[PDB]
Write a structure and sequence with these properties.
- The structure is cut from a larger assembly and holds one copy of chain A (78 residues) and five copies of chain B.
- Chain A is built from three helices and no strands.
- By secondary structure, chain A is mainly alpha-helical.
- Chain A starts with 24 loop residues before the first helix and ends in an 11-residue tail after the last helix.
- In chain A, 12% of the residues are buried.
- Chain B starts with 19 loop residues before the first helix and ends in a 26-residue tail after the last helix.
- Chain B has one helix and no strands.
- Chain B is elongated.
- Chain B is mostly loops and 51 residues long.
- The chains are: A mainly alpha (78), B little secondary structure (51).
- Chains in contact: A-C, A-D, A-E, A-F, B-C, B-D, B-E, C-D, C-E, D-E, E-F.
- At the C-D interface, strand 1, helix 4, strand 10, strand 22 and strand 24 of C face helix 1, helix 2, strand 1, strand 12 and strand 20 of D.
- Strand 5 of chain E pairs antiparallel with strand 1 of chain F.
- Chain A: Keywords: Membrane, Transmembrane, Transmembrane helix.
Chain lengths: 78, 51, 458, 459, 206, 51
């Protein structure tokens, strides 16, 4: 007698997957049985998300302004 | 089933073909895999012509 | 003659040098090849469905990489040429011939790009294709590749109107062009479609309008004018069918489970193209171009292209080709490369002196390439020992480099061809104009993690 | 103008994260320093294999045994002298008649060349396999040498008119050499252990083709081909011929041979399976279906349609026979295209390979999975593996466990219209033409060595 | 004139695919056989009025200067698509349950050159039609649409049935390769049939 | 399939105007089969458990 149109599958691709927690890669990356299709129909469309890339960028930057002065001094100038 | 277009649904029939010869040639825990190249660092250098 | 009689004196002739070279308790003898197991897999071709636009000349269409796969390691585009037939009521009347431009493919495919769901992964165009195929051609396949791209002497041979002796009509045979991508350069580099479910891999191909895909030459004066629909029978087919195919490879369940859920790093090669610089030798002979690149460049290919007529392409000479005897395209006598010398400067520091053009033309490809170009032009420089090697070699990143400039000196033939006055069939009856094009080939690093891919260094 | 005194330093000063990731590190293998390692001590020399049965002659089969007393066998070739051919004015065609050697004289005059161990057909091949292999895996630079070795050098295939005509040249009696493609000749790491195989009698059987069908007799006007006769040429037909089989043997050190003596050895080899030829008549139907019954892990398939109207002309995979041209030379008529229009693989009504164009197999597949691209019409390839020429195994499926598959081929309109006659003079298809589809498969096998004997292990 | 069965023609190898896997595919022969064998009487007139053959599109029309100058009308036509979910109400596609697959329909039309019959008045011969023969040329582009019916259900079960493994039985098609027959040479023809699953019916026509 | 004499005589032409078989006739045989199958829905995706 009532209806909503949000979703029906719960937490298999958990919504909070982009944060730092336990992973669930053992299910949606491999078909369960031979002949099963691939699980990417709506999940595709969100590229380069997840905080891992942002944290990697922050770690790479860290101190580039102060570390760029020397850089190749130990490699080129004799 | 279909003929003009089937995708990769026909890629399982030839994959399922296993025998003793196939187990001798391919497979195994120590079998190297293609599509995955290992990169090793090399020296840092430069070159240019001179008189 | 005796069968095996001197086979033992050679073995007995053993000395200190032979002991130093051969011998040893750990010698790796020949005739014994160690066989190692390899992973079980299969491969098959597959059509790639298009998602945006329709295949037509002058427009662009986007084709998505097929999903439900395991790996992608190839890509090619097939296109069927239309029918061309000259009509007696053309602009030039009887003094007119029609032919396809030299290197029909590598043309009508410009700004061909690969993108990853939000970002331009890479792109290439005609100049890059020509330079790469001239400098990295595996002989034996040269004739075959030429046949696929065109140059069959059946499409590039001019045909007069139907009222002349030559009533030949250009045939309509489909042609195929491979797409040079980082996953197609090497077998070890492939796209993990199963591992990347959060991205939509797309290839955008923009075609060129048919007006400049056809050369409409004059038999007598050797001039080119733009084509028109009324010139040929039927009309100008703006839309034409074109398909994209690629090879999809499947892997074993155990291997896919092992590789699923891991962090991967790959090295890829992309390109950057500096804007074309129009050059007029009528005032000065030295031309300087600033280079602003991003990543670790490996090679720099620079050419001077004749741009007098848009119908003719891949013309890096100083004189346009002309119709000759036998209803065939020919190259006039004074067709030499405009460049006489070139030099590099790193912030008022001449790295390379005023080397002759023959240096980049012959010596550099002889030492640091797999082939030497057979056409005039196509000058290259390389910072690496092997340009075609996927594994990195010596290079330098232009991001940390200060402003870099390239200087080119023209030639007397170029400065006399720029001005007109040439007689009939000389190839420079009209004044000629030239454009300097510079392209670079560099390195990059891509990262695979969390069911997605991106460039960490950026 | 700095001569390499600061430009290098400027370039090296540009060091960043990307360069740190690519180059550098304590484990970086610098260039200009190559680690040299010792190899085995050995030597090599050629010998002549000892004939064991019969006398060589065109149209017969002769066997030659592998010589003993050696230590390895890794190369074999066959050399033979061709007779001197001189036409006469008394031929049936009269003045309007020319005689010339067939295209690809080698890969012809030989059929069903086989290598056997004691009593077993270890390997065998023939003209179709030789042509396909030499067209798909030809190393560039050696193509001219291979042509000078086999034929098609404008000295054998140039038509020669009768003695009374202006062209009275005679075909030179020069000798020719053909290498034998075998599993021990594919790679230097694969060689026959002659010392370790004393209990096996290794034989090579060569069946020469009749000289009558090796000479093309062409009409100068109507472009018709008829079988040759003894009275046509001077000296008759020399049925006997001098053919010699040479081999290359290699001696190794005593320590090496004692180490490798008395042990179990596993070898992976290459073989050939040729399906029976299928007669094709495009007039009746435009589609031809042929079943394939193969045994082991097939690696590559090479198929083509051969024009088989006359037995004299060989390796003619186009849709029209060649005709005499101006200047006493052979030329291909303007209507010379591959009869195949499309091909398809079917696995019991499961289309694994879709109905794509013939040019796909002709060009795209060799461009990616081969070391060369054919320069002649025909020769369509489908390879299950990444590299056909590589001896190391790659992706390949075995047909023994796979229920019989089928190949479907579509004839071209040019083929169906050339099947009927009616062609004018010097058109090639003046007479009705007949075609035969041929399919060749290349696969993998395992050879076991122990106890001074060889045999296929149960696998 | 228009060819007999204008619809069931110009639609060949129509396929329905999940994600990127070919799930079903049918063509003109299957359409003709199914609609001629499992036709519910009473709707036959509606079908023969909605898929062409309306006794107006198929009537030959002479040239403009002849007695019959009538032009074939341009009226829209509809063709239902027989699929496993359309066969029965009980079999329906759970779109709410399948969000990770792209369900798609691939339809290949046919060139208008072989859709029009150009008949000879006297000798009764057929030759291909050309653009210049008819007025207005041939429009390669055409406006065609696909309509599908959806159903909405309450939360009492639309979420309850989710998360459970469901097995459904469907009916597919297998088509044997076509073989050319020449009765002049042979009096009998043998065709080897190879199929995979539990076959139910076999339709063979020449 | 054993053909009919009517088809045999219709294959050859020679018929007069408006006879239908005035031109030589060519025939083709088509065979279609209908089969069952099983489709399984699980974890937001579908596949053939038998294939």
């Amino acid at each position: 007698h009532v209806r909503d149109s949000h979703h029906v599958i719960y937490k298999r691709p958990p919504v909070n997957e982009y944060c730092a927690e336990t992973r669930e890669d053992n299910s949606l990356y491999v078909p369960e049985y031979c002949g099963q299709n691939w699980k990417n129909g709506v999940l595709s469309g969100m590229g380069t998300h997840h905080d891992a890339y942002r944290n990697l960028a922050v770690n790479m930057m860290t101190l580039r302004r102060e570390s760029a002065v020397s850089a190749g001094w130990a490699h080129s100038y004799l | 089933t279909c003929t003009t277009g089937a995708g990769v649904t026909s890629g399982f029939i030839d994959l399922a073909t296993y025998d003793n010869l196939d187990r001798a040639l391919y497979g195994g825990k120590d079998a190297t895999t293609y599509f995955i190249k290992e990169h090793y660092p090399v020296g840092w250098f430069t070159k240019l012509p001179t008189m | 003659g005796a069968g095996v009689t001197s086979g033992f004196i050679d073995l007995a002739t053993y000395d200190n040098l032979d002991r130093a070279l051969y011998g040893g308790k750990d010698a790796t003898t020949y005739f014994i090849k160690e066989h190692y197991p390899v992973g079980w897999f299969t491969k098959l071709p597959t059509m790639a469905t298009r998602v945006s636009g329709n295949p037509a000349f002058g427009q662009e269409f986007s084709v998505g990489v097929p999903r439900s796969g395991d790996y992608v390691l190839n890509a090619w585009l097939t296109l069927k040429t239309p029918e061309i037939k000259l009509l007696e009521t053309n602009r030039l009347g009887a003094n007119g011939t029609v032919r396809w431009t030299k290197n029909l493919m590598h043309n009508a495919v410009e700004h061909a790009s690969l993108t990853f769901n939000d970002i331009c992964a890479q792109q290439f165009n005609t100049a890059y294709l020509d330079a790469w195929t001239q400098f990295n051609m595996c002989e034996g396949k040269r004739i075959g590749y030429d046949n696929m791209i065109g140059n069959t002497s059946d499409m590039t041979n001019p045909t007069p109107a139907q009222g002349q002796d030559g009533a030949r009509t250009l045939p309509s045979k489909n042609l195929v062009l491979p797409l040079p991508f980082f996953f197609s350069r090497d077998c070890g580099l492939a796209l993990p479609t199963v591992v990347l479910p959060y991205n939509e891999i797309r290839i955008n191909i923009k075609l060129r309008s048919l007006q400049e895909l056809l050369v409409f030459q004059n038999k007598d004066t050797g001039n080119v004018i733009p084509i028109s629909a009324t010139d040929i029978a039927g009309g100008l087919a703006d839309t034409v069918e074109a398909y994209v195919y690629m090879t999809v490879g499947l892997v074993s369940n155990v291997e896919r489970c092992a590789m699923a859920g891991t962090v991967r790093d790959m090295v890829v090669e992309q390109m950057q193209a500096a804007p074309t610089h129009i050059v007029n030798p009528q005032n000065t002979n030295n031309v300087h171009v600033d280079m602003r690149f991003s990543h670790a460049v490996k090679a720099l290919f620079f050419m001077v292209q004749n741009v007098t007529y848009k119908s003719v392409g891949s013309n890096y000479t100083c004189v346009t080709p002309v119709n000759g005897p036998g209803n065939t395209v020919m190259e006039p006598a004074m067709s030499v490369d405009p460049i006489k010398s070139a030099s590099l400067t790193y912030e008022n520091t001449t790295r390379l002196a005023n080397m002759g053009v023959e240096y980049y033309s012959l010596v550099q490809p002889w030492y640091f390439s797999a082939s030497i170009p057979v056409y005039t032009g196509y000058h290259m420089y390389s910072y690496a020992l092997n340009v075609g090697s996927v594994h990195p070699s010596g290079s330098t990143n232009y991001g940390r480099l200060t402003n870099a400039s390239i200087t080119v000196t023209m030639s007397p033939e170029s400065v006399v061809a720029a001005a007109g006055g040439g007689n009939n069939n000389s190839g420079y009856n009209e004044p000629q104009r030239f454009a300097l094009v510079v392209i670079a080939v560099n390195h990059n690093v891509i990262r695979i993690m969390n069911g997605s891919m991106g460039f960490p260094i950026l």
